[PDB]
Amino acid sequence: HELYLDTSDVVAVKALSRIFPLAGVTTNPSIIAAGKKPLDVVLPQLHEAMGGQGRLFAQVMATTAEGMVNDALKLRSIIADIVVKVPVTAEGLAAIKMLKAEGIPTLGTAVYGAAQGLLSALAGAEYVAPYVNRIDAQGGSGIQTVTDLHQLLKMHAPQAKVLAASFKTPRQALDCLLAGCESITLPLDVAQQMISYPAVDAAVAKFEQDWQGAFGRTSI
Amino acid sequence: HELYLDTSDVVAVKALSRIFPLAGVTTNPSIIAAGKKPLDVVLPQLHEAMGGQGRLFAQVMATTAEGMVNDALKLRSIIADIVVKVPVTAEGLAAIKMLKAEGIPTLGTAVYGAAQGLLSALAGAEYVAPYVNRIDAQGGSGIQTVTDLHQLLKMHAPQAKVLAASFKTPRQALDCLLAGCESITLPLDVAQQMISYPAVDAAVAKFEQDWQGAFGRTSI
Amino acid sequence: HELYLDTSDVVAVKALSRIFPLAGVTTNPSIIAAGKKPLDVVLPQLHEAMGGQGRLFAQVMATTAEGMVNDALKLRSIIADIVVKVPVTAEGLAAIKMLKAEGIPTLGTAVYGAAQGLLSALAGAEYVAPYVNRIDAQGGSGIQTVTDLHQLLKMHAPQAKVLAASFKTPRQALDCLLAGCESITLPLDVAQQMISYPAVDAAVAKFEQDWQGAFGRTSI
Amino acid sequence: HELYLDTSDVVAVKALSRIFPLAGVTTNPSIIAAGKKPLDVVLPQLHEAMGGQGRLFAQVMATTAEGMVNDALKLRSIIADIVVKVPVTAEGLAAIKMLKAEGIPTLGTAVYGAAQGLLSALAGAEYVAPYVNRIDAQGGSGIQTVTDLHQLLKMHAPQAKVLAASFKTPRQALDCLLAGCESITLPLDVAQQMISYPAVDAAVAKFEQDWQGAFGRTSI
Amino acid sequence: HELYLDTSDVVAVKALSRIFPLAGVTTNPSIIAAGKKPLDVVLPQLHEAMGGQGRLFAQVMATTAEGMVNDALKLRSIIADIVVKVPVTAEGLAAIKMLKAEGIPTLGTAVYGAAQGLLSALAGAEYVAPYVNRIDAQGGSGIQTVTDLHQLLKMHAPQAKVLAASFKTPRQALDCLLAGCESITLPLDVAQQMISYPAVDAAVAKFEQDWQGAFGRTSI
Amino acid sequence: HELYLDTSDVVAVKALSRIFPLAGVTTNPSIIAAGKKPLDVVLPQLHEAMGGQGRLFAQVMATTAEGMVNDALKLRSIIADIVVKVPVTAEGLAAIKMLKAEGIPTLGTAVYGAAQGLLSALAGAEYVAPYVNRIDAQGGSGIQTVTDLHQLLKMHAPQAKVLAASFKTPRQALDCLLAGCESITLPLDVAQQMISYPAVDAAVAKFEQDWQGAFGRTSI
Amino acid sequence: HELYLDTSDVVAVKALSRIFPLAGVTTNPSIIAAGKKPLDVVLPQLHEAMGGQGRLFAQVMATTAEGMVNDALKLRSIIADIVVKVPVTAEGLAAIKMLKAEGIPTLGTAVYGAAQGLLSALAGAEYVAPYVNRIDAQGGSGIQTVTDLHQLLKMHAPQAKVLAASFKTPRQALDCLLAGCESITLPLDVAQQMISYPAVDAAVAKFEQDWQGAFGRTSI
Amino acid sequence: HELYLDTSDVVAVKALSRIFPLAGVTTNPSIIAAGKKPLDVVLPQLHEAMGGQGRLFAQVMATTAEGMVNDALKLRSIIADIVVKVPVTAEGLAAIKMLKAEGIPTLGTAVYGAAQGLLSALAGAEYVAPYVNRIDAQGGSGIQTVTDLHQLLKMHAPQAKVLAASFKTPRQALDCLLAGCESITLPLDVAQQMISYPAVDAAVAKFEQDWQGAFGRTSI
Amino acid sequence: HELYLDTSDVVAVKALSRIFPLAGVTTNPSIIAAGKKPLDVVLPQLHEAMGGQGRLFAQVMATTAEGMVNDALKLRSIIADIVVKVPVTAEGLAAIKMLKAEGIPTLGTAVYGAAQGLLSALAGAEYVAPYVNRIDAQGGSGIQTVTDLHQLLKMHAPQAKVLAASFKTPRQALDCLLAGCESITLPLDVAQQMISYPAVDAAVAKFEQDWQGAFGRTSI
Numbered sequence A, B, C, D, E, F, G, H, I: 001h002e003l004y005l006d007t008s009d010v011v012a013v014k015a016l017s018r019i020f021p022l023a024g025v026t027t028n029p030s031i032i033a034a035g036k037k038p039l040d041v042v043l044p045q046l047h048e049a050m051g052g053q054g055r056l057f058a059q060v061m062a063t064t065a066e067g068m069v070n071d072a073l074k075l076r077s078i079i080a081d082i083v084v085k086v087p088v089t090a091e092g093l094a095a096i097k098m099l100k101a102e103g104i105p106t107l108g109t110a111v112y113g114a115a116q117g118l119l120s121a122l123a124g125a126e127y128v129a130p131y132v133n134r135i136d137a138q139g140g141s142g143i144q145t146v147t148d149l150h151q152l153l154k155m156h157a158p159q160a161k162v163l164a165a166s167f168k169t170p171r172q173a174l175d176c177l178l179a180g181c182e183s184i185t186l187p188l189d190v191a192q193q194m195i196s197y198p199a200v201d202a203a204v205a206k207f208e209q210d211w212q213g214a215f216g217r218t219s220i
Helices: A010-017 A029-035 A039-049 A065-078 A090-101 A114-122 A132-137 A142-156 A170-178 A188-193 A198-215 B010-016 B029-035 B039-049 B065-078 B090-101 B114-122 B132-137 B142-156 B170-178 B188-193 B198-215 C010-017 C029-035 C039-049 C065-078 C090-101 C114-122 C132-137 C142-156 C170-178 C188-193 C198-215 D010-016 D029-035 D039-049 D065-078 D090-101 D114-122 D132-137 D142-156 D170-178 D188-193 D198-215 E010-016 E029-035 E039-049 E065-078 E090-101 E114-122 E132-137 E142-156 E170-178 E188-193 E198-215 F010-016 F029-035 F039-049 F065-078 F090-101 F114-122 F132-137 F142-156 F170-178 F188-193 F198-215 G010-016 G029-035 G039-049 G065-078 G090-101 G114-122 G132-137 G142-156 G170-178 G188-193 G198-215 H010-017 H029-035 H039-049 H065-078 H090-101 H114-122 H132-137 H142-156 H170-178 H188-193 H198-215 I010-016 I029-035 I039-049 I065-078 I090-101 I114-122 I132-137 I142-156 I170-178 I188-193 I198-215
Strands: A002-006 A024-026 A055-059 A083-087 A106-111 A127-130 A161-164 A183-186 B002-006 B024-026 B055-059 B083-087 B106-111 B127-130 B161-164 B183-186 C002-006 C024-026 C055-059 C083-087 C106-111 C127-130 C161-164 C183-186 D002-006 D024-026 D055-059 D083-087 D106-111 D127-130 D161-164 D183-186 E002-006 E024-026 E055-059 E083-087 E106-111 E127-130 E161-164 E183-186 F002-006 F024-026 F055-059 F083-087 F106-111 F127-130 F161-164 F183-186 G002-006 G024-026 G055-059 G083-087 G106-111 G127-130 G161-164 G183-186 H002-006 H024-026 H055-059 H083-087 H106-111 H127-130 H161-164 H183-186 I002-006 I024-026 I055-059 I083-087 I106-111 I127-130 I161-164 I183-186
Touching: A002 A010, A002 A055, A002 A161, A002 A188, A010 A039, A010 A188, A029 A039, A029 B198, A039 A055, A039 A065, A065 A083, A065 A090, A083 A090, A083 B198, A090 A106, A090 A114, A106 A114, A106 B198, A114 A127, A114 A142, A114 B170, A127 A142, A132 A142, A132 A170, A132 G170, A142 A161, A142 A170, A142 B170, A161 A170, A170 A183, A170 A188, A170 G132, A183 A188, A198 F198, B002 B010, B002 B055, B002 B161, B002 B188, B010 B039, B010 B188, B029 B039, B029 H198, B039 B055, B039 B065, B065 B083, B065 B090, B083 B090, B083 H198, B090 B106, B090 B114, B106 B114, B106 H198, B114 B127, B114 B142, B114 H170, B127 B142, B132 B142, B132 B170, B132 C170, B142 B161, B142 B170, B142 H170, B161 B170, B170 B183, B170 B188, B170 C132, B183 B188, B198 G198, C002 C010, C002 C055, C002 C161, C002 C188, C010 C039, C010 C188, C029 C039, C029 G198, C039 C055, C039 C065, C065 C083, C065 C090, C083 C090, C083 G198, C090 C106, C090 C114, C106 C114, C106 G198, C114 C127, C114 C142, C114 G170, C127 C142, C132 C142, C132 C170, C142 C161, C142 C170, C142 G170, C161 C170, C170 C183, C170 C188, C170 D114, C170 D142, C183 C188, C198 D029, C198 D083, C198 D106, C198 H198, D002 D010, D002 D055, D002 D161, D002 D188, D010 D039, D010 D188, D029 D039, D039 D055, D039 D065, D065 D083, D065 D090, D083 D090, D090 D106, D090 D114, D106 D114, D114 D127, D114 D142, D127 D142, D132 D142, D132 D170, D132 H170, D142 D161, D142 D170, D161 D170, D170 D183, D170 D188, D170 E114, D170 E142, D170 H132, D183 D188, D198 E029, D198 E083, D198 E106, D198 I198, E002 E010, E002 E055, E002 E161, E002 E188, E010 E039, E010 E188, E029 E039, E039 E055, E039 E065, E065 E083, E065 E090, E083 E090, E090 E106, E090 E114, E106 E114, E114 E127, E114 E142, E127 E142, E132 E142, E132 E170, E132 I170, E142 E161, E142 E170, E161 E170, E170 E183, E170 E188, E170 F114, E170 F142, E170 I132, E183 E188, E198 F029, E198 F083, E198 F106, F002 F010, F002 F055, F002 F161, F002 F188, F010 F039, F010 F188, F029 F039, F039 F055, F039 F065, F065 F083, F065 F090, F083 F090, F090 F106, F090 F114, F106 F114, F114 F127, F114 F142, F127 F142, F132 F142, F132 F170, F142 F161, F142 F170, F161 F170, F170 F183, F170 F188, F170 G114, F170 G142, F183 F188, F198 G029, F198 G083, F198 G106, G002 G010, G002 G055, G002 G161, G002 G188, G010 G039, G010 G188, G029 G039, G039 G055, G039 G065, G065 G083, G065 G090, G083 G090, G090 G106, G090 G114, G106 G114, G114 G127, G114 G142, G127 G142, G132 G142, G132 G170, G142 G161, G142 G170, G161 G170, G170 G183, G170 G188, G183 G188, H002 H010, H002 H055, H002 H161, H002 H188, H010 H039, H010 H188, H029 H039, H029 I198, H039 H055, H039 H065, H065 H083, H065 H090, H083 H090, H083 I198, H090 H106, H090 H114, H106 H114, H106 I198, H114 H127, H114 H142, H114 I170, H127 H142, H132 H142, H132 H170, H142 H161, H142 H170, H142 I170, H161 H170, H170 H183, H170 H188, H183 H188, I002 I010, I002 I055, I002 I161, I002 I188, I010 I039, I010 I188, I029 I039, I039 I055, I039 I065, I065 I083, I065 I090, I083 I090, I090 I106, I090 I114, I106 I114, I114 I127, I114 I142, I127 I142, I132 I142, I132 I170, I142 I161, I142 I170, I161 I170, I170 I183, I170 I188, I183 I188
Parallel strands: A002 A024, A002 A183, A024 A055, A055 A083, A083 A106, A106 A127, A127 A161, A161 A183, B002 B024, B002 B183, B024 B055, B055 B083, B083 B106, B106 B127, B127 B161, B161 B183, C002 C024, C002 C183, C024 C055, C055 C083, C083 C106, C106 C127, C127 C161, C161 C183, D002 D024, D002 D183, D024 D055, D055 D083, D083 D106, D106 D127, D127 D161, D161 D183, E002 E024, E002 E183, E024 E055, E055 E083, E083 E106, E106 E127, E127 E161, E161 E183, F002 F024, F002 F183, F024 F055, F055 F083, F083 F106, F106 F127, F127 F161, F161 F183, G002 G024, G002 G183, G024 G055, G055 G083, G083 G106, G106 G127, G127 G161, G161 G183, H002 H024, H002 H183, H024 H055, H055 H083, H083 H106, H106 H127, H127 H161, H161 H183, I002 I024, I002 I183, I024 I055, I055 I083, I083 I106, I106 I127, I127 I161, I161 I183
Antiparallel strands: none
16 A cells, blocks of 8 residues: 655654554645745755655646657656656546557546546556545545446456545545545545544543552653 | 557557557447448557557458358458457357357457356457447446446456447446456547646646746746 | 436427326426527427426526525526526535525535535535436446435435436436435436336237237237 | 136136135136137126126227227127226327226236336326246246335335236246235136145044044044 | 233233233134144133223134125124135235225235235235235245235325234234234233243342342332 | 433432433332342332332242232332233233223333243233343343334333333344334443443543633633 | 535635535634634635625533533524534533534534444434544545444434545545435635536637637637 | 256257257156156167266166166166156165166265255265245245255265256246255256247347348348 | 255155255254164164265253363264254353364254354354244244355355255245255255145146047156
8 A cells, every 4th residue: 555645844744654554645736836846946945854765746838749758768867766657638548548558657636527537547547536525525426436437447457547636634544445445545634533542542641640649650 | 459440541540659559459340330431441540559569450341150250251351460349149150150260359249248248258258349439328237237247247258348338438447447348449539638638738837836836937 | 216308309209298296397408409409499399398386497597696696586587486507616505505694595506426416415405416427427327326316315415316317228227216315307308218118019019919818819 | 805717617617716815807818719709708708707796997909099999889888887907008008097097907017127117197097917937937037027116016006906817837926926916816726726735635634534533433 | 002911821811911901812723732622612702801892803614705694704703803814815905895895894814915904905904914924934024015015005095094913023013003903913922922031030139139138128 | 202220229210210211210129139129129219219219120039820910919008000011921911901991001121032921911011111131131132122022012001111121232232223112221330331422422522622722611 | 415524714715605515614623723713703704705695513521511502602693594513522422412402403423433433423413524534544434334324213303414525536525425414514725626626627728629610709 | 967858758959959069968767757768778779868977867667776776777788877856755765775886887866955965965965855835836946946055965965966856947946056066857847938038039039120220131 | 055854764865865966964952853863873773864975963962061072072983974952052152162173074053043143153063953933933034144144255265165954944944045045954854835735736737638549658
């Protein structure tokens, strides 16, 4: 299994990388934009902030398949082993096929439907990223889409993995994981909620109180 | 998994073959007729329009088993490696057995029922093509038929594959894929709907707007 | 239950109204446009073509709530008892509330989600029209939406009815009916498929043959 | 609930009417033909063979709606209170609407699909008769069709009843009854199987043997 | 709900009638035979052993419908308000119809199938008695038969009640009750097991020990 | 719905009765014994500790039906409107029938099986108390037993209510409530757990902190 | 059904109240604090911003039952018909009972469990507000809790309603509605997402384009 | 998978063997009797009519285990590799054990129950033949018996196969195939129905019409 | 799979061992007692009555672990390869651990719960014997207990097998087998019922009648 953080926040990544068992960091154009640093700056910084290990992902911006391939080469010149995110559109699909032929690993992104996601895998994408909360927010079922997509990849393109993305609550992440998603990427607020519980803090406090009561201290 | 287009439209096939990850093209008599070009013209054209690679399918027309075998030889003389579609009737079954003995690969077509489809596979057919929308349109359940058929092939004739056909909406294709169909063939309109989503176009537009806002351009 | 035809084809409506048990005819801007006749022409013609009975529906075009209310008055001046279709957007919702206060019956249209549909009913809409095939085509589940929407209306706005729309195959219409939809509107090709079956024609032929065989004629 | 026999066998009807709690007898053109007696002979004979009580059904033969209405009048002139069976086709539907207006009760027959059946009820048919075994034999699911039809009538045309027909085995009848069918018609062989069980005969024999053993006779 | 004991054991009935909330006693020819007393002896004795209240059931022995009607009259002359058990066979069905016309309440017995049971109720039987363990012993599902039968009576002959019979274990009785059986009859060994539990006896002993421990006695 | 406390702790009852919406208090011989006060002392004290309102339950100790009736009279002489708990044994059942005739309301207790529980209700018991945790602890399913029992009462003795008892964890209580239990009795430790949650305390603390931050105090 | 907004944003409430069919506005201490206006200011402003109609909710801050009752009186003196939110703690429960006796309507809030919620309703609360996302975020199932709570209220305290709260995504709101929640409160971001869909905007644009194409304008 | 025909009709077998992919032919005493030819005549004829290939099955007639073994030797002397059908009775079980020791392959027949069928397999039978329609006709569930039996063989006697028999409708055959039956035997009327469909004939006709329309002929 | 008979009836074992495919015979103290022969007599007799092959089981009588080990040695001195049945109590568990260390194979018996059974397997027992009918009779679910026990062994102690015991009807045996029990032991009455069916005897009779009718004899 591969756990990613969905962020361009270099300081947070450094701090959270000693806590979480991270496989890497994912980015997209809105996440990069929000951080305000250009790709040739943030990407190496993000790579460093993880101890020079782990995988990175970043997205193309061009509209044509040829332009997307060129974007991919630019991305790869910044981070040699970077996975290239390609939106799963008509031109994106063509681009994914071209990048497969060139031996550059891709992720099929902006996936709102299971069949769409599958097509990106059949075209050669190694990862497929459904936008879970986007599908939920827009009146669908992000979890069903993810469930269906995982099953499709498993049956029809087993070299490919679901990389579930776009989350507002840990329940969504949990359901994706329960659906079998082999990778996932969490925004910072959801990741932090996933490791902080009032009930757990109360259990820890109780242990300290019981220890204190018997031994006259809270240390071992 | 094998993705086919269900068409005699050579220009569309050429254009769509750079976009979709196609295994080939399927035809039937109505699709050929609608295109108005004879078999000895369209078939080589379709083969070329895919970059001289991928599989082709075409259908016999004769009413007797012996006539169907002769039709198969005619088809094979046009395209050497072509898969011969045989309607799953009494004579069709007998023909499929004869073509198995002669080492010519067949597809059992015009399948409206699961048992019928299974018989064609037991007789030697390598592919079995239920008409999903035809079953749906005529008051049955195309998806249940496909689901039952796939299970039957898997348990009772595992060398054979379901090639799901006859579609009016992507939901039908998705359900066939979810049922485990190892091949599928899409008409052009459904294939195009499967790669074009307003929600996806909006997500792409958003990315461009965010990028523009931060970097003063929409390019990488 | 209320059965509608989804069409601006006056001749077809006349012919099909003696066959089907119709409650009326529904229209939308694309259907009106495709027929090329303006509203003040088609609407009275469609009303007549049904024997001066049954309900009509037509859609507003304006972008603001105030403009939509004015469109509604224009529609009502053409057909006095017409149900006004309002797209379920922010302004549409406001318009529906205003039209409720004015005593003009509405239908909440362009529904792609269950909650969206419910809101239109809570605002005062008497009908709610999900676009079944549009949801299917775009990678969702038109049937699940419809199922969820019907349940929501029944529990939370029981005065309102689902008017299921947008169909490419009878199976979709059947599933909406099975889900409990109290109204439905069919395009012409789907309606016609719903009353024409090879298996039924073969059963009728068989009856005639048996009768002939015993009685020397095919008449009673 | 209404139990019918599906037969033109007058002697069998007389014998079986003292055994079964019959509501009547149904016929169709193949059943009439097989008995070789004309309608003006068998019908009154069947009516008499039931003790001059119970309902009768018989089917029109004409191809046009007008011709079917005329066939209905001919049937009604033979048996005044007879229910007229109309195949659920385009013309049949129109005929059912006409016969509704004329106050002549109808049954919508040759039903191979649920929606088809529902339309016949919405048109005014009091009974709807799906051909269970015909649907089963032709690769579908007769029981699912019946199930779906019963639900549709109950939700959308509650004045109408399912009259389940076409049986090769009691299990089919049982499943229709379990699905809620408010009427049913059995052929003679199935009806007889439904009241004759080896296990039951063995239980009766046992009782007699035990009685004999204790009391020296098999009588009470 | 109606609870019966399935027995000809007069002494046991007297003893168990102060314990169980009995509606009556059922008998059949094997049960009468095993007790060795003739009907004109055991029946009045059983009636008395219940405090001159509650319902009795006994079974006919004749093979023809006419003979069964005569057996019924004989049974009624012994016990005026007795329910007559008629095996559900062809002649039994005819007999039930005749006894319905004569106003003598009947129970349809020796039921090994749900449809069979339903026919006896449609014919006029007030109770229908499936032989649960006989069905289980002979490789079927007694519980499913009972479940199906109850549903059939409820939907199709609601004046009639299931009187579940033939038990080797309390689990069978429980399941019949859970399936909604409005009456039941237990043999003595199963009834006794249904009120005697080691776990219950231990809970009672525990209460006495705790009481004794605190209050120095086991009495209140 | 009726919420009880399962206790002989008079001080706790007084304190908890201002917090919980109590219908009363239940006792059994182990609970009375543990409290060490005799029935003629604790019962009036418990009645008072609830503000002289609410229902009380207490259990007989005798082994014979007659002795149990006498115990019931003794209990009723202490608390005039008390519900008498009778263990559901052979003699208990007989006692419950006798008490029904005498117009003294009973509860059938020490219930470890559903059929057992039902027999107590048919005998005249107004409440039926399965020992949930006892069934769980002894390798069964307390929740299933309760679920089955509730259904049995509802179908077969609808005047009677399940009073679910014997709990070690709130989950058990929750599941009994979810299963439809119309009454329940909680021990003190489980009741207190049911109103005290770390997560809830943290939400309250958060509200106070936010209020303080904006308004400079924690009060309204 | 009752739709609320969860906010202290007066300007937003005014703007959104012409769009949504609102029953009122809910507040809690964190929402009030975040808006920075004191209760005696925001509450009347919120009331006005809804056209002087609809229901308001606000929460007590005190720690003791007596103090919470006093807080309630203070809230009622600001808004005469306001519903008082009481955290469901031990003291909160006591306070709810006291407020019931005083005829002041309450809502049981900070509900993290179904049984907890039920107790607040049994104590007299008219609404019960589970924190859906809080339960989801902290590793539980907000939807199951809501589902279980609704069923509990319906079976055991039917005068009370679920008012579902705490949302990060529309899917959560949808599932609560589907679970039968009779009231709901949405934060502004979720409410806005619930009425804005790319697919719907594309359908509207399409209608305008088709209209323009046929009629030379986009207006009616 | 193994497909058999259930017949003694030598001419039909010859004709149908070029159509169906047959593994052989099964017989039983009623099927042999109905054909009127003795075993030493029909069996070699049936063997020849299949092209001297495929498996044959025939049934013993004796009542004792020893007599059944002798019958088996007689059958084997007619057809050297014939599978011997033995009714699954007490003596039949003993016979099957004896034939296992002698190396003669058996089929356990006249199976009406799953446990019965399993015992025959544990005794050494290579095939087990439940009578599907016999179970259905006699008020059980043939499909459930088959389903249960297959699962029992797979878990407890995996060397053995279900050979499903006794059919009146293709649906039954389909359901047995869906349940996993590794072999099946069809009577001629069911087998013929399984390959002849009105809907399929209509699709073929349509293809010919379209071809004719474009190319001026119906041939390839 | 292993089929046992549960009996001390030497003559019956001899007779039934040529019919059933037996793995052996099981005994317990009640079964031995009922047969009245001491262990040193019946055990060798039972061993002989099976042709000197197959496994035997017998039970210890001592109360302490040490005493049970000594009982085991006594049993093993009578039958060298006998499996020793140990009741699954605290001392039994200790005994099973001791006997594991001594290399003497054990069966954990008197199992009324799944977890209890599992503990006996973890302690070293090779077989675990739940008392199915005992659990059923005492208000539990024997089948659920068996189902749960089998799963526990399979997951947690896979060297151990369920040996299902204690039966009053074949249905119970069937359901244990369906649950996956790898061994079973039947009492004689249930075993006999499992191979004797009225429906099967009628099918055999029918075959003989048909044969006779065509060939003038009932022999082959």
